[PDB]
mmCIF file of C-alpha atoms in Angstrom:
data_model
loop_
_atom_site.group_PDB
_atom_site.id
_atom_site.type_symbol
_atom_site.label_atom_id
_atom_site.label_comp_id
_atom_site.label_asym_id
_atom_site.label_seq_id
_atom_site.Cartn_x
_atom_site.Cartn_y
_atom_site.Cartn_z
ATOM 1 C CA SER Z 1433 26.857 0.006 -26.348
ATOM 2 C CA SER Z 1434 29.413 0.732 -29.061
ATOM 3 C CA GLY Z 1435 32.428 2.273 -27.314
ATOM 4 C CA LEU Z 1436 34.318 2.892 -24.081
ATOM 5 C CA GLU Z 1437 35.352 6.577 -24.425
ATOM 6 C CA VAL Z 1438 33.108 7.375 -21.419
ATOM 7 C CA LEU Z 1439 35.627 5.604 -19.130
ATOM 8 C CA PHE Z 1440 38.039 8.500 -19.818
ATOM 9 C CA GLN Z 1441 35.625 11.286 -18.919
ATOM 10 C CA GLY Z 1442 36.494 13.423 -15.945
ATOM 11 C CA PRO Z 1443 39.758 15.110 -14.973
ATOM 12 C CA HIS Z 1444 42.097 12.153 -14.708
ATOM 13 C CA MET Z 1445 43.000 12.580 -18.378
ATOM 14 C CA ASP Z 1446 44.515 15.939 -19.320
ATOM 15 C CA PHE Z 1447 42.814 17.800 -22.173
ATOM 16 C CA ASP Z 1448 45.865 17.387 -24.413
ATOM 17 C CA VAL Z 1449 45.742 13.592 -23.961
ATOM 18 C CA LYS Z 1450 41.967 13.493 -24.545
ATOM 19 C CA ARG Z 1451 42.463 15.590 -27.648
ATOM 20 C CA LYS Z 1452 45.119 13.273 -28.990
ATOM 21 C CA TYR Z 1453 42.945 10.219 -28.323
ATOM 22 C CA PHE Z 1454 39.922 11.921 -29.935
ATOM 23 C CA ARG Z 1455 41.909 12.594 -33.115
ATOM 24 C CA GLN Z 1456 43.244 9.032 -33.175
ATOM 25 C CA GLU Z 1457 39.726 7.561 -32.818
ATOM 26 C CA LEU Z 1458 38.389 9.680 -35.716
ATOM 27 C CA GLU Z 1459 41.272 8.279 -37.783
ATOM 28 C CA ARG Z 1460 40.503 4.728 -36.732
ATOM 29 C CA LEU Z 1461 36.868 5.238 -37.730
ATOM 30 C CA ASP Z 1462 37.960 6.462 -41.172
ATOM 31 C CA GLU Z 1463 40.248 3.520 -41.982
ATOM 32 C CA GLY Z 1464 39.814 2.428 -45.574
ATOM 33 C CA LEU Z 1465 37.654 5.474 -46.305
ATOM 34 C CA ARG Z 1466 38.915 6.737 -49.634
ATOM 35 C CA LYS Z 1467 38.794 10.505 -49.280
ATOM 36 C CA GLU Z 1468 39.217 13.105 -51.993
ATOM 37 C CA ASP Z 1469 39.035 16.893 -52.379
ATOM 38 C CA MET Z 1470 35.568 18.468 -52.646
ATOM 39 C CA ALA Z 1471 35.126 21.906 -54.185
ATOM 40 C CA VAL Z 1472 33.038 24.441 -52.322
ATOM 41 C CA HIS Z 1473 32.070 27.360 -54.574
ATOM 42 C CA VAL Z 1474 30.888 30.481 -52.733
ATOM 43 C CA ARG Z 1475 30.487 34.198 -53.279
ATOM 44 C CA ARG Z 1476 32.591 36.064 -50.714
ATOM 45 C CA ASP Z 1477 29.499 38.095 -49.740
ATOM 46 C CA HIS Z 1478 27.193 35.046 -49.343
ATOM 47 C CA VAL Z 1479 29.374 32.446 -47.692
ATOM 48 C CA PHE Z 1480 26.743 31.115 -45.362
ATOM 49 C CA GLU Z 1481 23.987 30.639 -47.959
ATOM 50 C CA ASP Z 1482 26.321 29.369 -50.673
ATOM 51 C CA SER Z 1483 27.970 26.905 -48.277
ATOM 52 C CA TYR Z 1484 24.537 25.671 -47.299
ATOM 53 C CA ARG Z 1485 23.582 25.189 -50.910
ATOM 54 C CA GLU Z 1486 26.918 23.508 -51.702
ATOM 55 C CA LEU Z 1487 27.116 21.162 -48.702
ATOM 56 C CA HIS Z 1488 23.878 20.624 -46.851
ATOM 57 C CA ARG Z 1489 22.906 17.717 -49.087
ATOM 58 C CA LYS Z 1490 26.283 15.964 -48.971
ATOM 59 C CA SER Z 1491 26.377 12.596 -47.236
ATOM 60 C CA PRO Z 1492 28.197 12.424 -43.883
ATOM 61 C CA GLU Z 1493 30.806 10.395 -45.702
ATOM 62 C CA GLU Z 1494 31.402 13.095 -48.321
ATOM 63 C CA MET Z 1495 31.720 15.668 -45.513
ATOM 64 C CA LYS Z 1496 34.905 13.843 -44.490
ATOM 65 C CA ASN Z 1497 36.477 14.974 -47.780
ATOM 66 C CA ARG Z 1498 38.996 17.810 -47.674
ATOM 67 C CA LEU Z 1499 37.118 20.988 -48.610
ATOM 68 C CA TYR Z 1500 38.594 23.016 -51.435
ATOM 69 C CA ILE Z 1501 37.154 26.570 -51.213
ATOM 70 C CA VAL Z 1502 36.691 28.576 -54.381
ATOM 71 C CA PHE Z 1503 35.683 32.240 -53.995
ATOM 72 C CA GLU Z 1504 33.502 33.093 -56.981
ATOM 73 C CA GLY Z 1505 35.276 35.287 -59.512
ATOM 74 C CA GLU Z 1506 38.513 35.695 -57.534
ATOM 75 C CA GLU Z 1507 41.348 34.679 -59.825
ATOM 76 C CA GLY Z 1508 45.103 34.813 -59.478
ATOM 77 C CA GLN Z 1509 44.863 35.264 -55.707
ATOM 78 C CA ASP Z 1510 47.206 33.150 -53.584
ATOM 79 C CA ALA Z 1511 45.622 29.800 -52.702
ATOM 80 C CA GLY Z 1512 47.032 29.307 -49.222
ATOM 81 C CA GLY Z 1513 44.789 29.740 -46.215
ATOM 82 C CA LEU Z 1514 41.422 29.783 -47.991
ATOM 83 C CA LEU Z 1515 39.880 27.064 -45.790
ATOM 84 C CA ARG Z 1516 40.933 28.963 -42.678
ATOM 85 C CA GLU Z 1517 39.453 32.131 -44.168
ATOM 86 C CA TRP Z 1518 36.195 30.337 -44.956
ATOM 87 C CA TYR Z 1519 35.854 29.003 -41.398
ATOM 88 C CA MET Z 1520 36.371 32.495 -39.993
ATOM 89 C CA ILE Z 1521 33.666 33.970 -42.271
ATOM 90 C CA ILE Z 1522 31.084 31.259 -41.714
ATOM 91 C CA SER Z 1523 31.740 31.535 -37.936
ATOM 92 C CA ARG Z 1524 30.615 35.178 -38.116
ATOM 93 C CA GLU Z 1525 27.718 34.390 -40.474
ATOM 94 C CA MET Z 1526 26.662 31.529 -38.202
ATOM 95 C CA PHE Z 1527 25.807 34.223 -35.656
ATOM 96 C CA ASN Z 1528 24.357 36.953 -37.889
ATOM 97 C CA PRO Z 1529 20.880 38.109 -36.662
ATOM 98 C CA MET Z 1530 19.533 38.058 -40.227
ATOM 99 C CA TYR Z 1531 19.511 34.265 -40.242
ATOM 100 C CA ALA Z 1532 17.704 34.305 -36.904
ATOM 101 C CA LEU Z 1533 19.438 31.097 -35.806
ATOM 102 C CA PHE Z 1534 21.380 32.281 -32.747
ATOM 103 C CA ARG Z 1535 21.292 35.182 -30.324
ATOM 104 C CA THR Z 1536 23.382 36.328 -27.382
ATOM 105 C CA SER Z 1537 22.544 35.012 -23.972
ATOM 106 C CA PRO Z 1538 21.069 37.452 -21.422
ATOM 107 C CA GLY Z 1539 23.931 39.320 -19.775
ATOM 108 C CA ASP Z 1540 26.883 37.673 -21.590
ATOM 109 C CA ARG Z 1541 27.441 39.211 -25.060
ATOM 110 C CA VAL Z 1542 30.187 36.664 -25.744
ATOM 111 C CA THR Z 1543 28.048 33.536 -25.595
ATOM 112 C CA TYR Z 1544 25.247 32.625 -27.940
ATOM 113 C CA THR Z 1545 22.201 30.376 -27.660
ATOM 114 C CA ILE Z 1546 19.647 29.035 -30.125
ATOM 115 C CA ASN Z 1547 17.018 31.613 -31.057
ATOM 116 C CA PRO Z 1548 13.618 30.285 -29.874
ATOM 117 C CA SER Z 1549 11.952 32.308 -32.641
ATOM 118 C CA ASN Z 1550 13.782 26.586 -43.844
ATOM 119 C CA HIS Z 1551 15.043 27.007 -40.288
ATOM 120 C CA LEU Z 1552 15.343 23.388 -39.063
ATOM 121 C CA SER Z 1553 17.389 22.511 -42.183
ATOM 122 C CA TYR Z 1554 19.756 25.407 -41.416
ATOM 123 C CA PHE Z 1555 20.160 24.339 -37.750
ATOM 124 C CA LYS Z 1556 21.105 20.876 -38.996
ATOM 125 C CA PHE Z 1557 23.586 22.502 -41.381
ATOM 126 C CA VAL Z 1558 25.102 24.556 -38.550
ATOM 127 C CA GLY Z 1559 25.523 21.374 -36.503
ATOM 128 C CA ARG Z 1560 27.270 19.838 -39.495
ATOM 129 C CA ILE Z 1561 29.585 22.835 -39.817
ATOM 130 C CA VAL Z 1562 30.545 22.820 -36.147
ATOM 131 C CA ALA Z 1563 31.339 19.078 -36.345
ATOM 132 C CA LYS Z 1564 33.159 19.575 -39.661
ATOM 133 C CA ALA Z 1565 35.406 22.237 -38.073
ATOM 134 C CA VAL Z 1566 36.231 19.891 -35.176
ATOM 135 C CA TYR Z 1567 36.793 17.017 -37.669
ATOM 136 C CA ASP Z 1568 39.121 19.197 -39.721
ATOM 137 C CA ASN Z 1569 40.967 20.425 -36.614
ATOM 138 C CA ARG Z 1570 40.031 23.990 -37.512
ATOM 139 C CA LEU Z 1571 38.631 26.542 -35.083
ATOM 140 C CA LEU Z 1572 35.321 28.409 -35.086
ATOM 141 C CA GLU Z 1573 35.166 31.799 -33.305
ATOM 142 C CA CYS Z 1574 31.807 30.852 -31.805
ATOM 143 C CA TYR Z 1575 31.117 30.603 -28.059
ATOM 144 C CA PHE Z 1576 27.971 28.936 -26.689
ATOM 145 C CA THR Z 1577 26.373 28.709 -23.277
ATOM 146 C CA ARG Z 1578 27.159 25.958 -20.808
ATOM 147 C CA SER Z 1579 23.870 24.123 -21.301
ATOM 148 C CA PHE Z 1580 24.394 24.111 -25.083
ATOM 149 C CA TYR Z 1581 27.775 22.352 -24.666
ATOM 150 C CA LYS Z 1582 26.123 19.879 -22.236
ATOM 151 C CA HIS Z 1583 23.504 19.084 -24.867
ATOM 152 C CA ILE Z 1584 26.228 18.203 -27.356
ATOM 153 C CA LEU Z 1585 27.926 16.039 -24.655
ATOM 154 C CA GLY Z 1586 24.658 14.204 -23.832
ATOM 155 C CA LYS Z 1587 24.706 15.569 -20.277
ATOM 156 C CA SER Z 1588 21.662 16.425 -18.139
ATOM 157 C CA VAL Z 1589 21.070 20.162 -17.873
ATOM 158 C CA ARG Z 1590 20.480 21.272 -14.257
ATOM 159 C CA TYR Z 1591 18.955 24.447 -12.789
ATOM 160 C CA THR Z 1592 22.487 25.474 -11.825
ATOM 161 C CA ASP Z 1593 23.300 25.689 -15.541
ATOM 162 C CA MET Z 1594 20.988 28.708 -15.539
ATOM 163 C CA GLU Z 1595 23.869 30.641 -13.969
ATOM 164 C CA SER Z 1596 25.516 30.499 -17.482
ATOM 165 C CA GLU Z 1597 22.330 31.173 -19.483
ATOM 166 C CA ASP Z 1598 21.045 34.084 -17.408
ATOM 167 C CA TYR Z 1599 22.576 35.131 -14.061
ATOM 168 C CA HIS Z 1600 19.777 37.453 -12.956
ATOM 169 C CA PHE Z 1601 17.136 34.749 -13.519
ATOM 170 C CA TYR Z 1602 19.289 32.256 -11.623
ATOM 171 C CA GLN Z 1603 19.389 34.687 -8.682
ATOM 172 C CA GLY Z 1604 15.595 34.595 -8.698
ATOM 173 C CA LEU Z 1605 15.522 30.807 -8.614
ATOM 174 C CA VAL Z 1606 18.051 30.861 -5.800
ATOM 175 C CA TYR Z 1607 15.843 33.213 -3.786
ATOM 176 C CA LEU Z 1608 12.809 31.024 -4.407
ATOM 177 C CA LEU Z 1609 14.625 27.841 -3.352
ATOM 178 C CA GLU Z 1610 16.274 29.289 -0.231
ATOM 179 C CA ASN Z 1611 13.252 31.048 1.297
ATOM 180 C CA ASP Z 1612 9.937 29.778 2.595
ATOM 181 C CA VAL Z 1613 7.148 30.697 0.126
ATOM 182 C CA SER Z 1614 4.615 30.857 2.993
ATOM 183 C CA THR Z 1615 6.284 33.972 4.308
ATOM 184 C CA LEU Z 1616 6.065 35.955 1.012
ATOM 185 C CA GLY Z 1617 2.695 37.572 1.633
ATOM 186 C CA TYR Z 1618 1.454 36.113 -1.653
ATOM 187 C CA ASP Z 1619 1.427 32.829 -3.626
ATOM 188 C CA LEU Z 1620 3.354 31.717 -6.695
ATOM 189 C CA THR Z 1621 1.921 29.635 -9.524
ATOM 190 C CA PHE Z 1622 3.465 27.454 -12.186
ATOM 191 C CA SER Z 1623 1.815 27.681 -15.602
ATOM 192 C CA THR Z 1624 1.472 24.260 -17.194
ATOM 193 C CA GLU Z 1625 0.950 25.923 -20.623
ATOM 194 C CA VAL Z 1626 4.162 27.997 -20.758
ATOM 195 C CA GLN Z 1627 6.199 26.438 -17.916
ATOM 196 C CA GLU Z 1628 6.934 29.739 -16.146
ATOM 197 C CA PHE Z 1629 6.235 31.096 -12.669
ATOM 198 C CA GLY Z 1630 3.554 33.688 -11.949
ATOM 199 C CA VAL Z 1631 1.551 35.192 -9.089
ATOM 200 C CA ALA Z 1632 -1.625 33.439 -8.012
ATOM 201 C CA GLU Z 1633 -4.947 35.186 -8.469
ATOM 202 C CA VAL Z 1634 -7.776 34.044 -6.175
ATOM 203 C CA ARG Z 1635 -9.134 31.753 -8.863
ATOM 204 C CA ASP Z 1636 -5.728 29.969 -8.998
ATOM 205 C CA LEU Z 1637 -6.178 29.105 -5.337
ATOM 206 C CA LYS Z 1638 -9.172 26.986 -6.421
ATOM 207 C CA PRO Z 1639 -8.834 23.596 -8.268
ATOM 208 C CA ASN Z 1640 -7.502 24.053 -11.798
ATOM 209 C CA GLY Z 1641 -4.886 22.711 -14.229
ATOM 210 C CA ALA Z 1642 -3.879 26.056 -15.700
ATOM 211 C CA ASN Z 1643 -1.899 27.443 -12.789
ATOM 212 C CA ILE Z 1644 -0.496 25.087 -10.181
ATOM 213 C CA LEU Z 1645 0.107 26.565 -6.716
ATOM 214 C CA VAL Z 1646 3.782 26.443 -5.725
ATOM 215 C CA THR Z 1647 4.576 25.098 -2.241
ATOM 216 C CA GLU Z 1648 7.625 24.310 -0.126
ATOM 217 C CA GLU Z 1649 7.093 20.653 -1.171
ATOM 218 C CA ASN Z 1650 6.855 21.170 -4.914
ATOM 219 C CA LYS Z 1651 9.014 24.256 -5.659
ATOM 220 C CA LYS Z 1652 12.158 22.283 -6.466
ATOM 221 C CA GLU Z 1653 10.290 20.268 -9.141
ATOM 222 C CA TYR Z 1654 8.817 23.426 -10.724
ATOM 223 C CA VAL Z 1655 12.203 25.175 -10.671
ATOM 224 C CA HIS Z 1656 13.431 22.117 -12.534
ATOM 225 C CA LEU Z 1657 10.600 22.373 -15.147
ATOM 226 C CA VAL Z 1658 11.029 26.112 -15.619
ATOM 227 C CA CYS Z 1659 14.777 25.600 -16.260
ATOM 228 C CA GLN Z 1660 14.184 22.619 -18.553
ATOM 229 C CA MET Z 1661 11.819 24.771 -20.673
ATOM 230 C CA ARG Z 1662 14.277 27.657 -20.973
ATOM 231 C CA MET Z 1663 17.322 25.539 -21.755
ATOM 232 C CA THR Z 1664 15.746 22.697 -23.725
ATOM 233 C CA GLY Z 1665 11.986 22.776 -24.226
ATOM 234 C CA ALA Z 1666 11.763 26.186 -25.876
ATOM 235 C CA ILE Z 1667 14.307 25.184 -28.542
ATOM 236 C CA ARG Z 1668 13.611 21.463 -28.740
ATOM 237 C CA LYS Z 1669 13.235 21.037 -32.533
ATOM 238 C CA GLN Z 1670 16.195 23.314 -33.337
ATOM 239 C CA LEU Z 1671 18.466 21.560 -30.860
ATOM 240 C CA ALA Z 1672 17.477 18.159 -32.231
ATOM 241 C CA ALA Z 1673 18.279 19.336 -35.750
ATOM 242 C CA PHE Z 1674 21.651 20.806 -34.726
ATOM 243 C CA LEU Z 1675 22.550 17.585 -32.843
ATOM 244 C CA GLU Z 1676 21.511 15.393 -35.742
ATOM 245 C CA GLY Z 1677 23.923 17.327 -37.967
ATOM 246 C CA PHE Z 1678 26.769 17.284 -35.470
ATOM 247 C CA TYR Z 1679 26.613 13.557 -34.663
ATOM 248 C CA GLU Z 1680 26.532 12.547 -38.346
ATOM 249 C CA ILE Z 1681 30.149 13.635 -38.423
ATOM 250 C CA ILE Z 1682 31.372 13.281 -34.804
ATOM 251 C CA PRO Z 1683 29.627 10.412 -32.979
ATOM 252 C CA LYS Z 1684 28.100 11.295 -29.619
ATOM 253 C CA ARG Z 1685 30.044 8.568 -27.855
ATOM 254 C CA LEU Z 1686 33.286 10.110 -29.091
ATOM 255 C CA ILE Z 1687 32.704 13.775 -28.228
ATOM 256 C CA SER Z 1688 31.422 12.712 -24.770
ATOM 257 C CA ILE Z 1689 35.012 12.229 -23.584
ATOM 258 C CA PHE Z 1690 35.273 16.044 -23.071
ATOM 259 C CA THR Z 1691 33.871 18.195 -20.275
ATOM 260 C CA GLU Z 1692 31.729 21.266 -21.114
ATOM 261 C CA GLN Z 1693 34.815 23.456 -20.607
ATOM 262 C CA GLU Z 1694 37.001 21.261 -22.816
ATOM 263 C CA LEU Z 1695 34.391 21.142 -25.659
ATOM 264 C CA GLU Z 1696 34.602 24.920 -25.832
ATOM 265 C CA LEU Z 1697 38.443 24.735 -25.999
ATOM 266 C CA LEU Z 1698 38.068 22.102 -28.767
ATOM 267 C CA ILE Z 1699 35.655 24.196 -30.876
ATOM 268 C CA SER Z 1700 37.000 27.709 -30.434
ATOM 269 C CA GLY Z 1701 40.594 26.881 -29.505
ATOM 270 C CA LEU Z 1702 43.011 27.040 -26.578
ATOM 271 C CA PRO Z 1703 43.799 30.726 -26.163
ATOM 272 C CA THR Z 1704 47.131 32.008 -25.019
ATOM 273 C CA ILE Z 1705 46.677 33.809 -21.746
ATOM 274 C CA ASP Z 1706 49.052 36.684 -21.047
ATOM 275 C CA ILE Z 1707 49.316 36.468 -17.252
ATOM 276 C CA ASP Z 1708 51.285 39.732 -16.960
ATOM 277 C CA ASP Z 1709 48.426 41.489 -18.784
ATOM 278 C CA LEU Z 1710 45.826 39.913 -16.454
ATOM 279 C CA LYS Z 1711 47.868 40.710 -13.322
ATOM 280 C CA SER Z 1712 48.303 44.360 -14.423
ATOM 281 C CA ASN Z 1713 44.511 44.524 -14.654
ATOM 282 C CA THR Z 1714 43.324 42.807 -11.471
ATOM 283 C CA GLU Z 1715 41.440 44.468 -8.603
ATOM 284 C CA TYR Z 1716 41.545 43.263 -4.995
ATOM 285 C CA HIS Z 1717 38.951 43.433 -2.237
ATOM 286 C CA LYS Z 1718 39.793 42.604 1.389
ATOM 287 C CA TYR Z 1719 43.144 41.413 0.024
ATOM 288 C CA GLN Z 1720 45.920 43.658 -1.111
ATOM 289 C CA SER Z 1721 48.271 43.248 -4.011
ATOM 290 C CA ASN Z 1722 50.879 41.882 -1.631
ATOM 291 C CA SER Z 1723 48.654 39.721 0.626
ATOM 292 C CA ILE Z 1724 50.330 36.345 0.829
ATOM 293 C CA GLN Z 1725 47.425 34.384 -0.753
ATOM 294 C CA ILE Z 1726 47.627 36.806 -3.725
ATOM 295 C CA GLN Z 1727 51.359 36.149 -4.273
ATOM 296 C CA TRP Z 1728 50.507 32.446 -4.076
ATOM 297 C CA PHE Z 1729 47.634 32.860 -6.515
ATOM 298 C CA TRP Z 1730 49.863 34.390 -9.227
ATOM 299 C CA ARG Z 1731 52.535 31.765 -8.656
ATOM 300 C CA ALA Z 1732 49.918 28.986 -8.951
ATOM 301 C CA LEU Z 1733 48.334 30.361 -12.139
ATOM 302 C CA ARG Z 1734 51.780 30.713 -13.736
ATOM 303 C CA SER Z 1735 52.491 27.122 -12.751
ATOM 304 C CA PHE Z 1736 49.412 25.896 -14.661
ATOM 305 C CA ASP Z 1737 49.706 24.542 -18.198
ATOM 306 C CA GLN Z 1738 47.992 26.087 -21.207
ATOM 307 C CA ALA Z 1739 44.746 24.129 -20.801
ATOM 308 C CA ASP Z 1740 44.521 24.863 -17.080
ATOM 309 C CA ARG Z 1741 45.173 28.550 -17.622
ATOM 310 C CA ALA Z 1742 42.318 28.616 -20.101
ATOM 311 C CA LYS Z 1743 40.018 26.707 -17.779
ATOM 312 C CA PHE Z 1744 40.888 29.275 -15.129
ATOM 313 C CA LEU Z 1745 39.694 32.067 -17.455
ATOM 314 C CA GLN Z 1746 36.514 30.060 -18.089
ATOM 315 C CA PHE Z 1747 36.048 29.569 -14.346
ATOM 316 C CA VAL Z 1748 36.197 33.298 -13.456
ATOM 317 C CA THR Z 1749 34.813 35.022 -16.603
ATOM 318 C CA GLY Z 1750 32.483 32.374 -18.012
ATOM 319 C CA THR Z 1751 34.353 31.927 -21.279
ATOM 320 C CA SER Z 1752 37.787 31.235 -22.713
ATOM 321 C CA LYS Z 1753 37.600 34.291 -24.953
ATOM 322 C CA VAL Z 1754 40.400 36.821 -24.340
ATOM 323 C CA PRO Z 1755 39.243 40.368 -25.101
ATOM 324 C CA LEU Z 1756 40.603 41.971 -28.265
ATOM 325 C CA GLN Z 1757 42.235 44.788 -26.282
ATOM 326 C CA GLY Z 1758 43.507 42.580 -23.467
ATOM 327 C CA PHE Z 1759 42.374 42.257 -19.848
ATOM 328 C CA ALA Z 1760 42.021 46.012 -19.358
ATOM 329 C CA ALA Z 1761 38.902 45.526 -21.515
ATOM 330 C CA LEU Z 1762 37.206 42.633 -19.703
ATOM 331 C CA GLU Z 1763 33.539 43.539 -19.417
ATOM 332 C CA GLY Z 1764 30.724 42.838 -17.045
ATOM 333 C CA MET Z 1765 27.062 43.625 -17.635
ATOM 334 C CA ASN Z 1766 27.251 47.397 -18.069
ATOM 335 C CA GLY Z 1767 30.777 48.161 -19.198
ATOM 336 C CA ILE Z 1768 34.286 47.345 -18.166
ATOM 337 C CA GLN Z 1769 34.700 45.083 -15.143
ATOM 338 C CA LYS Z 1770 38.302 44.005 -14.489
ATOM 339 C CA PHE Z 1771 39.175 40.611 -13.038
ATOM 340 C CA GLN Z 1772 38.730 40.966 -9.279
ATOM 341 C CA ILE Z 1773 39.741 38.784 -6.327
ATOM 342 C CA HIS Z 1774 37.889 38.953 -2.987
ATOM 343 C CA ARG Z 1775 38.931 37.396 0.272
ATOM 344 C CA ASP Z 1776 36.368 34.734 1.231
ATOM 345 C CA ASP Z 1777 36.172 34.697 5.025
ATOM 346 C CA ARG Z 1778 34.322 31.379 5.275
ATOM 347 C CA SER Z 1779 36.082 28.078 5.992
ATOM 348 C CA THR Z 1780 39.450 27.399 4.311
ATOM 349 C CA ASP Z 1781 37.921 23.974 3.659
ATOM 350 C CA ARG Z 1782 35.950 25.428 0.744
ATOM 351 C CA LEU Z 1783 37.286 25.618 -2.818
ATOM 352 C CA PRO Z 1784 37.619 29.064 -4.320
ATOM 353 C CA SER Z 1785 34.358 30.098 -5.978
ATOM 354 C CA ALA Z 1786 33.495 32.381 -8.893
ATOM 355 C CA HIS Z 1787 30.883 34.966 -9.919
ATOM 356 C CA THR Z 1788 31.398 35.221 -13.678
ATOM 357 C CA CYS Z 1789 28.875 38.036 -14.100
ATOM 358 C CA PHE Z 1790 31.451 40.224 -12.313
ATOM 359 C CA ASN Z 1791 34.658 38.408 -13.337
ATOM 360 C CA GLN Z 1792 35.074 37.754 -9.624
ATOM 361 C CA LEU Z 1793 37.116 35.174 -7.777
ATOM 362 C CA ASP Z 1794 36.326 34.468 -4.109
ATOM 363 C CA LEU Z 1795 39.498 33.122 -2.599
ATOM 364 C CA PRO Z 1796 39.621 31.663 0.937
ATOM 365 C CA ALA Z 1797 42.654 32.582 3.072
ATOM 366 C CA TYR Z 1798 44.452 29.262 2.506
ATOM 367 C CA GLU Z 1799 47.264 28.292 4.811
ATOM 368 C CA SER Z 1800 49.975 27.303 2.323
ATOM 369 C CA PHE Z 1801 50.968 27.747 -1.295
ATOM 370 C CA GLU Z 1802 50.596 24.053 -1.997
ATOM 371 C CA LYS Z 1803 47.045 24.006 -0.602
ATOM 372 C CA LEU Z 1804 46.050 27.128 -2.557
ATOM 373 C CA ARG Z 1805 47.401 25.628 -5.776
ATOM 374 C CA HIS Z 1806 45.693 22.323 -5.119
ATOM 375 C CA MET Z 1807 42.340 23.948 -4.239
ATOM 376 C CA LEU Z 1808 42.369 26.304 -7.243
ATOM 377 C CA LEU Z 1809 43.180 23.412 -9.651
ATOM 378 C CA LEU Z 1810 40.217 21.454 -8.225
ATOM 379 C CA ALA Z 1811 37.913 24.451 -8.558
ATOM 380 C CA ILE Z 1812 38.978 24.988 -12.157
ATOM 381 C CA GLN Z 1813 39.121 21.438 -13.480
ATOM 382 C CA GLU Z 1814 35.658 20.610 -12.153
#
């Protein structure tokens, strides 16, 4: 053991305080390090490849130098804001299909995951860049899936994390787990070769290691293995490369102070959330605009601080990214889907819940403003 940052995990410490501590610990770890400026020469139209050439071989120590960006052949242009410009470009390039490194997650066009389909060196370099941005206190306009942030944090990925990767697939796992397989009219199998579910043929009902029959007793374990393959196994070498690059700059023990939600805010920034714009673009179901719990909801959200407002956006939409055109342009699967609040008629003992595929908040009919505010904060900060 080489640190105690883990003792500050969880919600007791506000994101702003965690952030300040995180910065101070990086500075402690760099005491006596004699930094200097390091030139990065790139062609404007090849930032990603040129940056890779210029930096991928640098030592972790050299990567702590201040980067001095020089755009090939561009002379007499103002020199302010070039590093910021470079981070914005490489953020876009770090998601370009032509490099085949990342791809959008099923359903959510905002969030990216590692492409399961040279390459390992580039993944390591991307991990380096993400850590370098965080180290520099500069933002990347790159959003990842929940399980990807957990990987960075050293946290165990669970089948519930599949709700961020792929909502429709998660629905299938939910159906499987909640219903007795013996009443299907057919049998499921688990393939040991690809770690996916299938339908048993007669020969699978006989002894074999190719397709294991799924039962009430074993389905939870196979749901676990199917999820582990999709979120970890299928991208195991790439992930390891990315992580190796990230940790060379930001130690695992240090970054682990943040939750999955807070790591996203650290990488891609704390957005400003225009509550009037959101409110003008909210739909209500089984509540009306003037239902008392709705008036309480707006008052509570407005009472939240910047970090908690952003975590609220993450809670209901799946990401902290505000749409370019404002909340009138929030999207679901197949087009626009405005933020929507539904009355949850189950016990007022429950926390509000969310269905991010539909930007939907399920809000119990709480009995007081203070309870609503308290319950919503719990739901969000989890």
